[PDB]
Structures are given as structure tokens and as C-alpha cells.
Amino acid sequence: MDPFASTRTFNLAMTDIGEMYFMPPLMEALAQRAPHIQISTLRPNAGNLKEDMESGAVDLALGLLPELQTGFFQRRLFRHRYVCMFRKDHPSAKSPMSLKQFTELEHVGVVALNTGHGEVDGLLERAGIKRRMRLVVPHFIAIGPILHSTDLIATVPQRFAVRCEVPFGLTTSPHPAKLPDIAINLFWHAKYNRDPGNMWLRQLFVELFSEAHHH
Amino acid sequence: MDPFASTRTFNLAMTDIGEMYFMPPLMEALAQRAPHIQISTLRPNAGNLKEDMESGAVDLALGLLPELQTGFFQRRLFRHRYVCMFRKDHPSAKSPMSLKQFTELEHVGVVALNTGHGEVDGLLERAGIKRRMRLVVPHFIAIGPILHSTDLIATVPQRFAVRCEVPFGLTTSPHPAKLPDIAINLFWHAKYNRDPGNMWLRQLFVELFSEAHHH
Ligand SMILES: O=C(O)c1ccccc1O
């Protein structure tokens, strides 16, 4: 069936950041290419996501999702690093920040339970980096106005940080801790590898967001 | 014990919008008034929130939470209405929008499962207002960039809409449907009505956010 004929609803898993990044250009393109398709999103749910992708309840997932392993396929959209972010007139924070100073200032922690970002707190702690967690929030999206009004600092994905800098008057430093890359991928389950609708929507994601040729 | 002595961690339930609104001024004030208190937040969870407030696992909840009834107390911070929001150069949407036009244009739906905002879809539908839901997302925070890049419209809390207008080039119309007020309240469970730490943090919320005298 041609894309214009499709009235299928595709269910897509992604974080708050992912929704702000992926949804505006996707829906813009869908209105031109397949205007009767419906999209619904949901936040990643580590308890349910694999099962939901196996059963076909969730069609695609986008983000840092290291648990989607055997039985899944992935295509790389881009990769980026964690950075330290803080307000631009912070009284003492500097770029490049020292590990000592990272460890002295107070933090907004981000739990990010159902994604690879949930690994950060344990990676720091096992390296023996103790942080004074003044505030802990579950997700990244509200970090910006919090850092603006305080002397707190945060460990944040670089592409999201860059989007926060001007609107909230923040700046960033390369991260002094050794943290892994953030690989942002498009995921699907092997059972839907040759489903024509899933294939078509995957190719659209690649066309709109893949930096394999770009960069 | 004096507030400077307190090292207590208070756990606070609020939406993404609530976190962006309440957390920056709260943490700013805490750094001046009670600098050793820790705060952690979480999103409202209708299955668990009442039980969690009864047991003392969640100290306070902020937002539109009509299920917190017998056994709870509430203080009004402010109230506001739903509005229609869309991009400022939308090719046909106008303010004041007609019910007919609301019903003709396509929508980004917001599920808002664990809050009173989860009532909107059913309230419209029972009034016989059928909407073409092109995109459905679980929460409000990412609505802004989506509306910017599309001809979609959305039913949104007015104070959040106003914050979106300039950064995302959107505008609003009074809502043509009959929808209830959005009462934004501070909630606590009766078991903690006279806990001195809970009382102190409630009074801070009232001082920072209550519009009872203001307005
Ligand atoms: O972490 C994500 O889920 C993400 C999604 C889109 C763009 C950048 C990101 O870090």
C-alpha cells in the first residue's frame, strides 16, 4: 500500500528530549508524505519496553537504550558526550572544570531510570566521585530554568545543553570525569524487520536524522 | 530544630510543567533559608500517589490532582483555564476560535494520565466534540516545538501556553469548548498536618507561589 493510503497508528518510545528533537520534523514531513498516518508516543519503560517491542505494541524506540540487545536491530543517528552545565555568571564554576571543583560544587542529579543515562550516577560513584546532590529530578527537560536560578551544576547530554545555553543563560564545560559516549540510535525488533510500514517509517527517520553521511 | 540544622530529604510530586515552574524559585530560596535540606521530585503516579502520601514516602504534591480527597488537605496556589494554542502564522486558525473550526483542524493530544488534565479527552468527547488526533503525546512539555513546525493545534493550560508563545512563535485563542477550571493546589496528607518539617516547607511554597493575596 502507498503511504497516502495508510491510516496506521505507529507507537514510538522516546524521552522528553527525544520528543522535542524528533517529533517536530517528523510530523512536518508526515503532513507532506503520509498525511493519514497517526503517531502516538510514550516514555521508555525498562520493565515493559522489550516485551512491548516483541509483541508489536511499540513499533520503534529512539535514544540511549543499551538494554535492547539480542533480537533487536539498531541504526546509529548520531553520538555526543556528557558535559557539565551551569549558569553563565556562576560565581566560581569554570570551563574546563577540574575534577576537584566538579566534586566541590552542588548538583542537580537526573535519575533517567529507563535509559542509559540512568548509568551516570553509578559510573561517577564507582570512580569514587562523591557529589553533593542538592536536588534530584527524574528527567532532563526542566534542568535549564533550575540551573539559571541557582549555583547548582548538572551532567547533561551535549546536544540538549547547547539548546539550553541561550534561552536559560547557561554555559558548559567538557566533563572532567571519564563518562561513556551517548550513542543515539533508532531501534526495532527483529519480528518487524520486514514489515513494510515499519520499514517505511524507519527510512524516514534515517532521512531526517541520520548523520552517517552528514558527519 | 531550626531550618539550618535540617538535613532532611523531602520528596515532592509534580508534573514536568510543575517542575519548571516550582523548582527554580524553591531551590533559590532553600539556598538562602535551609541550605542543608535535600529535595527529590517525581511525576504523579495515580496508582501509587495516595498510598505514597499516606506512608510518608511522598511529602507534598503540586498540580491538578482531583483524586486527592478524603484524608488530604489542599491550599489553592492559583487557578487558570485551558486555551487553544497554534503557531502564529497558522494558515486558518483564528482567535477567538469557533467550535466548528476547533473540530475541523487536526490536534496534538496530551494524555496526562496521572492528573486532572487526563480528563480533557473524555470531557470533549462526551460533549460530542470529535477531534482528529494526528499525534498523541503523554505530557505537555514538548507541545511547543511540535506546534511551531506544523498546522496542528492543542488544548493547553494557559500559564504554560503563555510561556510557549515567544520562544516557539505561537499564539492562543480562548477555548470554544466548555472545559473546567484548572485549580493548582499544594496537597498533603492529614497524617503529616502537624509534622514541623512538612509545615515549614508548605509555608515556603505558600510564600513563594500563593496568589490568594496577590490576586
Ligand atoms: O538522550 C536522548 O534520548 C536524546 C534524544 C534526542 C537528541 C539527543 C538526546 O540525547
Ligand SMILES: O=C(O)c1ccccc1O
Ligand atoms: O502499512 C502501512 O501502513 C504503510 C505505511 C507507510 C508506508 C508503507 C506502508 O505499507
Ligand SMILES: O=C(O)c1ccccc1O
Ligand atoms: O498543571 C500543572 O501541573 C501546573 C503546574 C504549575 C503551573 C501551571 C500548571 O498548569
Ligand SMILES: O=C(O)c1ccccc1O
Ligand atoms: O524537621 C525538619 O527537618 C525541619 C526542616 C525545616 C524546618 C523545620 C524543621 O523542623
